[PDB]
Design a protein around this ligand. Structure first.
Ligand SMILES: CCC1=C(C)C(=O)N/C1=C\c1[nH]c(/C=C2N=C(/C=C3\NC(=O)C([C@@H](O)CC/C=C(\C)CC/C=C(/C)CCC=C(C)C)=C3C)C(CO)=C\2CCC(=O)O)c(CCC(=O)O)c1C
Ligand SMILES: CCC1=C(C)C(=O)N/C1=C\c1[nH]c(/C=C2N=C(/C=C3\NC(=O)C([C@@H](O)CC/C=C(\C)CC/C=C(\C)CCC=C(C)C)=C3C)C(CO)=C\2CCC(=O)O)c(CCC(=O)O)c1C
Ligand SMILES: CC1=C[C@H](O)CC(C)(C)[C@H]1/C=C/C(C)=C/C=C/C(C)=C/C=C/C=C(C)/C=C/C=C(C)/C=C/C1=C(C)C[C@H](O)CC1(C)C
Ligand SMILES: CC1=C[C@H](O)CC(C)(C)[C@H]1/C=C/C(C)=C/C=C/C(C)=C/C=C/C=C(C)/C=C/C=C(C)/C=C/C1=C(C)C[C@H](O)CC1(C)C
Ligand SMILES: CCCCCCCCCCCC(=O)OC[C@H](COP(=O)(O)OCC[N+](C)(C)C)OC(=O)CCCCCCCCCCC
Ligand SMILES: CCCCCCCCCCCC(=O)OC[C@H](COP(=O)(O)OCC[N+](C)(C)C)OC(=O)CCCCCCCCCCC
Ligand SMILES: CCCCCCCCCCCC(=O)OC[C@H](COP(=O)(O)OCC[N+](C)(C)C)OC(=O)CCCCCCCCCCC
Ligand SMILES: CCCCCCCCCCCC(=O)OC[C@H](COP(=O)(O)OCC[N+](C)(C)C)OC(=O)CCCCCCCCCCC
Lengths: 67, 168, 107, 169, 106, 67
């Protein structure tokens, strides 16, 4: 009888992606971890603090659009 | 720029439940590679493993209730893992998985006991990812072939054994 | 100030398939929410029906709530994440996008 | 930068409930000063508050169900506010409060109807802060003497009137 | 997969005093949580008792859960500073949050 | 019983307090709002976005200590 409808798209920002491609904390340390002998041979990224934090930061859907 | 998890924002890879229980110290993840144990007390302890199974976690004087062991084999995906939950042994390798000895179709779902909602172990595989959880112990783990994450509940504080060490 | 009585039953359970470590669930809550005044009783009764679906790993999520007061009030909330891959640490699970909708109908 | 709120951290002044409903656009705060209306759509509308009441919010065609009015009486803490929730009139001034033309002990917290859990209005005062809420309309407000915040639920979208304007859609 | 039947009754109400616009609450949940297997022939029944207090404006918060088949209990408390009229201005009490969590098994 | 306890104290960081005493965004705008005629005669700080954001940022208990 009265309806409210909100569509919402969550995306990753450009800034987050730019940061993940650079060398600052924690993405630099992650890149260093990827050359260490315990990690380097695998298909998976290092199970390190640096790569994990980097993963969380990057996958946060900070860009919200309403329609 | 921002360095903390914000649960106000949806995350494409992670749950609120996981990251909230983790950042509030309810779970205590331990990462073991072929070369190093990364303790939940924030310490890197070197261990270059044999093919002797080495105690990484377990209850102090009840290893049947909960214990976790790690082996190195050789070649690519060299890490082998033994997880004991309420006297039910899960063995993980690059090739798949077994419960007590008997190999199981881990690429579908597998639960033991299959009928019991208070299950000793559930285990699932997709590509080289293996996940495992026990409702009896509340120990979660996951496995890549290169490393394993063994996550203990904080309720084990004061009863923690193995290379993963103190819960603080 | 007010007093509350809420009786409810939750039924439903785990959905077959997928990652059973993070097994999908479908749940129904049915109940009645009663507010009472302090000074004597003016009494407000609201029927509650809640329907939750959350697939394995919470990939697809639905929350529907129907209230009937004694007027009608409902909400459908949906949230859809991309299909996963083995490495959670590596970017590129599908389109890396969240699709959400919220709908409220007041009768 | 309100949506840089992180609910993972405890906050000493704010609830999760308030900031989560606010950052997700469930509430639509409007601030009215003596000089300006700050709309929920992010516009500053200059309006010099006078001795006559001006409509700041209300449901289209139904000000008895919900309407909110502002005037100024001059002097220190000059703002007067009228909140109408389901035919029940709250008046706020710097000197306290009244409900349907009778003054009430707002410092001890007041509900009308006093017996009704579906209350038309609750109101409470501490120093010069007044808070108000209606379970019937879901309109919250608070008041300092200098300004009022009138917060409508987003469920009013397409029926909103007054100087606060549209609810963002 | 497992099926669930959770019956519960919530009682409680508002606490007198303080800011009634954000009136304090107390709640008591009692109920029984039943998990069944696929057959429903393995059954796990857990008695559930939950006690919640949140005082006016959520200043003082308490969550207590007791679970029984043996026994598992938790008390969680969270205490914020006392407010002042201006939420925008720093200096509400000691600007500190005090939390405690206790878990007893057996 | 086997019975384990965690105490937690949440506090405001020095960095947050230093930022609130400075003039960068949003604290500068808030200080400017405090001298406007519509706000200055009140005991309450301006009901502006600047002062509100600044309030939320400063009151976030970022410093956590376990005992
Ligand atoms: C513009 C922002 C702003 C500025 C610039 C400023 O100066 N102040 C501002 C906002 C502000 N706002 C503030 C506080 C509060 N705002 C609200 C507002 C609401 N609370 C509500 O619950 C609602 C509802 O409209 C929400 C939607 C509800 C419905 C449509 C219906 C509910 C009923 C039924 C039957 C359906 C139920 C269904 C379910 C599924 C549950 C609003 C508008 C409140 C009150 O909570 C506060 C007080 C503080 C607090 O709560 O923490 C506060 C704190 C004040 C203080 O402590 O002194 C501030 C600072
Ligand atoms: C150091 C951290 C880390 C690094 C460096 C890294 O590389 N990875 C790391 C962690 C990590 N961890 C991950 C995931 C998950 N971790 C868990 C862990 C748990 N979940 C739990 O619920 C628990 C419990 O132990 C919590 C505590 C519970 C109790 C004490 C209650 C006991 C039960 C009672 C009383 C009631 C029983 C019922 C009755 C009726 C009586 C843990 C340890 C999980 C699983 O949830 C995941 C998967 C992801 C997710 O959940 O989202 C994931 C994601 C995996 C992926 O998706 O690929 C990652 C990346
Ligand atoms: C554990 C276990 C175990 C065993 O084995 C089994 C069992 C028992 C089964 C289990 C259990 C379970 C459970 C309990 C669960 C739960 C869940 C939930 C609660 C969900 C929700 C869920 C929920 C959901 C979806 C939600 C969502 C939401 C949304 C979308 C929102 C939206 C929106 C939008 C758009 C926009 C606007 O602006 C606003 C909003 C409003 C913000
Ligand atoms: C509105 C209304 C209206 C009318 O008028 C009336 C009525 C009806 C009454 C009302 C209603 C209400 C309600 C529903 C409520 C709810 C509540 C809740 C849920 C709570 C919680 C609550 C909750 C709570 C406290 C919680 C908390 C928690 C905590 C502390 C935690 C802790 C911790 C610590 C230390 C640390 C470690 O490491 C871990 C942890 C674990 C993390
Ligand atoms: C004891 C309980 C307390 C611990 C926390 C548990 C709460 C949620 C668990 C319910 C399980 C479930 O079925 O959730 C269903 C989902 C979980 O989605 P998600 O977490 O983003 O996971 C997605 C995981 N992916 C990315 C791997 C696929 O929810 C939702 O779609 C609704 C989320 C609403 C967001 C609104 C903001 C509020 C944030 C909270 C601030 C503290
Ligand atoms: C919000 C603050 C309050 C408390 C915060 C919660 C922190 C979480 C700690 C452990 C999480 C957990 O799982 O809790 C206990 C269990 C989960 O056990 P699991 O089957 O081992 O699932 C592990 C997760 N997997 C499957 C994804 C790996 O959930 C339950 O429903 C337990 C059922 C019995 C109790 C039900 C009564 C609850 C009443 C609620 C009234 C408010
Ligand atoms: C056990 C959980 C495992 C991991 C995460 C939990 C850690 C603790 C965090 C929670 C704190 C807590 O529950 O504390 C107690 C909370 C409130 O506190 P607050 O929101 O901070 O407001 C404090 C406000 N002051 C600073 C002004 C005093 O009381 C309440 O809920 C009571 C009723 C509200 C229901 C909560 C709904 C919130 C969002 C709803 C979606 C729109
Ligand atoms: C976090 C887990 C639980 C949710 C936490 C809620 C936070 C508590 C405070 C805010 C609550 C709120 O705003 O809505 C709670 C609602 C209505 O709100 P109200 O009475 O207008 O607001 C007054 C308080 N104010 C000023 C702080 C906003 O209560 C009611 O009786 C409404 C009748 C509907 C019955 C609900 C049945 C659904 C049960 C769902 C079971 C799965």
């Amino acid at each position: 009888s009265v309806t409210i409808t909100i569509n919402q798209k969550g995306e990753i920002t450009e800034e987050q992606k730019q940061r993940a491609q650079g060398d600052d904390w924690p993405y630099g340390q992650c890149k260093e971890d990827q050359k260490k002998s315990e990690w380097k041979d695998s298909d998976f990224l290092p199970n390190t603090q640096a790569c994990y934090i980097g993963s969380i930061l990057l996958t946060t859907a900070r860009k919200t659009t309403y329609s | 720029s921002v360095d903390d998890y914000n649960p106000a924002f949806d995350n494409t890879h992670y749950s609120r439940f996981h990251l909230l229980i983790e950042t509030n110290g309810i779970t205590k993840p331990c990462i073991v590679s072929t070369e190093n144990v990364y303790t939940p007390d924030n310490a890197t302890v070197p261990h270059k493993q044999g093919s002797d199974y080495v105690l990484v976690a377990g209850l102090a004087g009840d290893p049947n209730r909960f214990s976790a062991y790690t082996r190195s084999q050789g070649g690519s995906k060299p890490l082998v893992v033994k997880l004991v939950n309420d006297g039910v042994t899960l063995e993980l390798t690059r090739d798949g998985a077994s419960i007590n000895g008997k190999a199981v179709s881990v690429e579908k779902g597998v639960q033991y006991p299959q009928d019991d909602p208070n299950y000793a172990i559930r285990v699932w595989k997709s590509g080289d990812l293996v996940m495992a959880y026990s409702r009896r112990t509340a120990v979660y783990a996951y496995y890549t072939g290169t490393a394993v994450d063994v996550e203990q509940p904080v309720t084990y504080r004061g009863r923690a054994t193995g290379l993963c060490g103190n819960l603080n | 100030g007010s007093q509350v009585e809420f009786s409810m039953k939750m039924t439903g359970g785990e959905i077959p398939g997928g990652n059973i470590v993070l097994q999908g669930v479908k749940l129904r809550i049915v109940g009645e929410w009663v507010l009472k005044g302090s000074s004597g009783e003016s009494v407000r009764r609201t029927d509650v029906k809640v329907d939750i679906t959350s697939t394995a790993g919470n990939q697809d999520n639905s929350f529907a709530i129907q209230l009937a007061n004694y007027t009608k009030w409902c909400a459908l909330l949906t949230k859809k994440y991309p299909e996963r891959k083995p490495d959670v640490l590596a970017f590129g699970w599908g389109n890396e996008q969240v699709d959400s909708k919220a709908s409220v109908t007041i009768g």
